[PDB]
Design a protein around this nucleic acid. Structure first.
Ligand SMILES: [Zn+2]
Lengths: 95, 120
RNA sequence: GGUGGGGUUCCCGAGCGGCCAAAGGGAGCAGACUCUAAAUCUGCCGUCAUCGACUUCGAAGGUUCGAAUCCUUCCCCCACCAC
RNA sequence: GGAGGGGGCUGGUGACUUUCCCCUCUUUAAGAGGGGAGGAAGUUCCGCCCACCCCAUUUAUGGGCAGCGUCCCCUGAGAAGGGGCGGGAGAUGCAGCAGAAACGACACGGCUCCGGAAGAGAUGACGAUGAUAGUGAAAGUUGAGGACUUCCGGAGAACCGGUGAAACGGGCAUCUCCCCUGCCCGGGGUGCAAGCCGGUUUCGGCGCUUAGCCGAAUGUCACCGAAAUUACAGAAGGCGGGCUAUAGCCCCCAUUUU
């Protein structure tokens, strides 16, 4: 099962996602699934049919699990998912 | 108190299973390059985690190119056992040809038949 | 300004690219032992605390089938120098 | 138009004080003039000027550097960043598990021959987990009143390895030599807190500066400009290369966007 604690190490591809906050104004309001994932980038296919390239470190993501909705920064999702499942420890201080 | 019941290798095996299931689910649509990307990421996490492939998704992929092999579409599967028992997978994309020798199971069946002959 | 080096468990300290391989010692807890206590021995030894399994080898990136180890960068800690 | 990356530059003038410093100068001792930290001074990875000690005096032998731009590999929003430079031989390693087998080839099983045992002549054994059966036998076409078989042990021409990242065969990394091309000839070791002098423990002087301190000097304000004392950040003998961190403007590239 996919847990909100290990979502820092679970695979993001194959999960519906929407973003709630970002510095880009037009980025806010997208909904879709995750297809491709690189070191700080998701390739998201919308339900409308548009592929978008979303950087991770500028936005916060809301991943839709089996019933759950988890809000995680992409600053926590830094690194390739290969190296992220190797081991990546990120500690963020929003002061 | 037990908070972490799932370890690193267990989530690695789950990522193997999810990525290769999504590889099968996305390989039938028409995007073989996306399925090649899934097989490439699963192979990279297999060499990284030092974990072995499951026996379900073991023979469904190609080692040379990395395309997920649909049997019939881009993979030709023929069983020949005249000289030696073998099941041959043939990649239609690049041309890499692999097989499944079954000599030792035939040896076990042969020893069982020898025991049935000697008991009778 | 300069040379020869070191950072690994709470503290002193080893470690061939490979199964917590992580030598360990002292420390804490528990057992054993004793009238009590010291000393000796046994297991946990960071966690679940019975076997066993996972994390940390100053930090990051990269190579590799796989990093305490090999490469690069960022650091700190030593020793001694004015004549 | 908005986060980000790379390259370029970082001072000048005027006033105050020798009581911020150094140098020069005249003069009823005090004034006047000039100059005063940067792209990295940091990191110490290096080389050269300068010194001492040894061998040697050699371009005979031999040593050192380079194969750049280009290309390859790896990671990024694919601009950009990092590493490398030709070929051969020898040695080591690719743990554990798996696989016949982990770096030169092989022993092993399917294939051929021989010896032993078991069943059998319109019977019976075997056979869709494939039968007499063929091909350069990796591979592919074949698919049954098909049909004379099976095992063990030994020896051999050709083909083949369910495993693993990587295999009857080609790779990877390290080390050492010889096969090249061009340039240069003293070879090593320590380093200015080296080394030298008055002194002979300890001190002062040279190295030392178109800034040159050492108990580590380079001050304050305004302004043209817009490159400005704002970020990283400070000399200590000097010069050149590379790395690290970013202030202001200029130029170039990318995502969202319209
Ligand atoms: Zn292929």
């Amino acid at each position: 099962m996919i847990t909100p604690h290990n979502i820092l190490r679970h695979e993001l591809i194959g999960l519906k996602v929407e973003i709630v906050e970002a510095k880009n104004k037009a980025m806010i309001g997208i909904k879709g699934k995750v297809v491709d994932e690189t070191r700080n980038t998701l390739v998201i296919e919308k339900e409308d049919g548009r592929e978008v390239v979303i950087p991770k470190d500028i936005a916060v993501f809301l991943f839709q699990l089996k019933g759950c909705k988890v809000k995680v920064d992409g600053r926590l999702l830094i690194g390739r998912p290969e190296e992220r499942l190797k081991k990546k420890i990120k500690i963020l201080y929003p002061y | 108190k037990k908070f972490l019941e799932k370890k690193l290798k267990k989530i690695a095996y789950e990522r193997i299973d999810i990525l290769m299931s999504l590889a099968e689910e996305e390989a039938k649509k028409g995007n073989w390059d996306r399925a090649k990307r899934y097989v490439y990421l699963a192979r990279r996490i297999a060499m990284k985690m030092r974990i072995r492939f499951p026996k379900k998704w073991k023979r469904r992929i190609c080692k040379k190119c990395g395309t997920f092999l649909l049997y019939g579409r881009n993979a030709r599967v023929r069983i020949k056992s005249k000289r030696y028992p073998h099941v041959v997978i043939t990649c239609l994309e690049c041309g890499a040809i692999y097989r499944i020798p079954m000599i030792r199971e035939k040896k076990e069946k042969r020893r069982k038949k020898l025991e049935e002959r000697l008991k009778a």
